[PDB]
Amino acid sequence: HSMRYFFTSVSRPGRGEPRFIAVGYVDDTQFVRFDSDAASQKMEPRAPWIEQEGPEYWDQETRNMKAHSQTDRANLGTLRGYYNQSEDGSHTIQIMYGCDVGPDGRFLRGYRQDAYDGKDYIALNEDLRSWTAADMAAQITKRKWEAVHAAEQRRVYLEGRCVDGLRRYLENGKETLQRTDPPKTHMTHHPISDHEATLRCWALGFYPAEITLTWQRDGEDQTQDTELVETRPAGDGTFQKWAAVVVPSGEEQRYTCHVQHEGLP
Amino acid sequence: QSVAQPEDQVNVAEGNPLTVKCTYSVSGNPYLFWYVQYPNRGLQFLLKYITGDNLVKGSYGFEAEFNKSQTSFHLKKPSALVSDSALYFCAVRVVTSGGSYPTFGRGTSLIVHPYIQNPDPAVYQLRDSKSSDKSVCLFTDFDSQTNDSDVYITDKCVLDMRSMDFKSNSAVAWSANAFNNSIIPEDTFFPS
């Protein structure tokens, strides 16, 4: 349904040239990668579906990706003046492309927002043709983009190459990209110190994402101060989630686990 | 400072990587900049160059590199975009108190004559409304190589249409024999 070329970069002044790393998340799984310290200096296709495409495709992948890797170094020569530092600022410039197609084939809407220092520096909007710089620095960047038809070129790229390539990826994915592995559930009772038990519903190995688990008790959504952490992968691309709650001893059966997935059977 | 581009006109078909030329001879640390002048519009810059890496990046897909062995920069690309018809020029900034910050020259022009999809030669003649006595002649789907004060024809005439990415390379003519300087093939659909 989605495909977003995540970019990232870091800088270590006084130690050479900056580093750049990139990935790709067709649907959710990762298929492409890049680095500035690797040995192949090309695109590495870890994916069972997108592996057989022509040598030109893998060979280029806009091999000027390591030209953007220097474009970012060029950018961090005026970003050094915008948030004025001297020379030593060890800083990151995140980039985020992305086109989201509809389940039938429509373009739906594409996304792109950039940030600096983990803080938003420029972004797109719903529809397109708009800039929303979030500092007194990137106002200059907003005006410069407004000058030479920048959003128009972004429109061209999004409505063209990103979404067409995502069609091609979906066609090549067959069922590997779209097979929707559902969760498998298990739980154990086990006690707490003296007068309490911990109900924990466990679901592992599911795919795709967008599943959340809220604690239930007699059908009510008592979203107490339950401590989850974040969305994590199970070592291959599969994700898993569990639950945690404190209940009094002898009084457990009232509590139940709510399981709902966009791909749930 | 002196900057020269000997190529006053560069012609590349849609099967050939683009090649142009830039030259300079100055002192100090020279900085070379490129620009594009789309026809009767702004002067967007796509190929900057200051220092550092040799194979300098460029917008879209363009690139170029600097070589001391020729003092050249040579804006190039493996497969130029479809339009790319402009007056690319290459300029250098000299050292001056506070900075001198495009002394390039006339640059060069690219024409990207396309050649696919079984061109079908044809000549036509078109009339107007009101006074219908006025009429013009028209051509249709010519080749990709063809290079008086009365009965004018046109200038170079190449288009692109976005319905099915077809083309209608043609030539109007305003007052049969008018195509005397043309080398139209024998299979022309000219109906006279």
Binding site: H68, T71, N75, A150, Q153, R154, R161, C162 | K57
Partner: peptide
């Protein structure tokens, strides 16, 4: 498929 409008800041 990637993007090639290498945006300047």
């Amino acid at each position: 498929f990637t993007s090639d409008y290498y945006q300047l800041y």
